[PDB]
């Protein structure tokens, strides 16, 4: 159950890179410095190759997952690429059945309570909150009452200024964008353990 493996490493590196070589170097300093949940988004050129490369990190303790799914074609980029989990925003119940057949965890990026109920009827009680910058921390406590089963992993609008605002509202992990990735393979390490420090110590 990814239910377990999230919860622990309360941070996911939502990684977007323009080239394939710059992708390798941004899973490098991220994983070497703190983060162990790596997300491989699909604005990346041929991310179904980068994941099949960085499989030697699954040994050393990494979770190379795919990101930003849009329909039932970027799950022809599915398990044969090495994806240990795939996410998206909200969309598409068939890639909850396309992965029901391949046996790999999916997470929708819910935004409205429709997206939350229509995807709870799926079975997914673990949700991404996208775009998290728009909904706000309000959306955690607001939905935690009537739906005491749904989890949230915010995506977007999560920086070190307001990271503990999401957590003690009540979330599972957080997905981080440019505030963690945008840099050189040294800024990318520094910015990553910068986050795991402000995360481990949310009072």
């Amino acid at each position: 159950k990814m239910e377990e493996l999230f919860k622990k490493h309360k941070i996911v590196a939502v990684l977007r890179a323009n080239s394939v070589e710059e992708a390798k170097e941004k899973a490098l300093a991220v994983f070497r410095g703190g983060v162990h949940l790596i997300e491989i988004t699909f604005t990346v050129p041929d991310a179904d190759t980068v994941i099949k490369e960085l499989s030697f990190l699954k040994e050393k303790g990494a979770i190379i997952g795919a990101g930003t799914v849009t329909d039932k074609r970027q799950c022809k980029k599915a398990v044969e690429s090495g994806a240990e989990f795939i996410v998206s925003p909200h969309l598409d119940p068939e890639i909850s059945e396309f992965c029901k057949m391949e046996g790999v965890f999916y997470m929708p990026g819910v935004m409205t309570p429709t997206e939350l109920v229509k995807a709870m009827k799926l079975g997914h009680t673990i949700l991404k909150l996208f775009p998290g910058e728009v909904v706000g921390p309000q959306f955690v406590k607001a939905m935690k009452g009537p739906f005491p089963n749904v989890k949230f992993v915010p995506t977007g609008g999560v920086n070190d200024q307001n990271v503990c605002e999401w957590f003690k509202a009540g979330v599972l992990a957080v997905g981080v964008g440019s505030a963690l990735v945008k840099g050189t393979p040294e800024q990318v390490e520094m910015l990553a353990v910068l986050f795991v420090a402000k995360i481990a110590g949310c009072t």
Partner: protein, 135 residues
């Protein structure tokens, strides 16, 4: 006398005779090179003696015997900070908070090592973590 010398070198350190305590830390290391304490103290004793380049050397052997003292990392990021390598010292303060995220010292002192390095962005985000870890 693998432990007796360590305590002797302490007593000598307690009387300002730090150079004279430097021997008693060697003579303890000579009797057991794995005594993690004799290294950390000798490093802090060379740091006080300001045998600065050699001071980081014992602080390296200590992080070998017990590779998880936020004390030995923090006190190595200091020695390396004066020594000159504000990059390896920035790695040291980082490896220290990689062990202890409640280090208001290694956070501030890395905010300085970084605000002097270049990234005001990356020094800010440690300067604004040191505010969380102190009233």
């Amino acid at each position: 006398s693998a432990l007796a010398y360590v305590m002797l070198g302490l007593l000598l350190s307690l009387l300002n005779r730090l150079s004279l305590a430097a021997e008693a830390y060697k003579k303890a290391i000579e009797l057991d090179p794995n005594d993690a304490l004799a290294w950390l103290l000798l490093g802090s004793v060379l740091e006080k003696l300001k045998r600065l380049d050699e001071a980081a050397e014992a602080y390296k052997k200590a992080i070998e015997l017990k590779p998880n003292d936020a004390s030995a990392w923090k006190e190595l990021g200091k020695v390396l900070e004066k020594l000159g390598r504000l990059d390896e010292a920035a790695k040291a303060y980082a490896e220290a908070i990689k062990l202890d995220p409640s280090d208001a010292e290694a956070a501030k002192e890395l905010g300085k090592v970084l605000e002097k390095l270049g990234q005001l962005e990356l020094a800010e985000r440690a300067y604004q973590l040191a505010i969380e870890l102190d009233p």
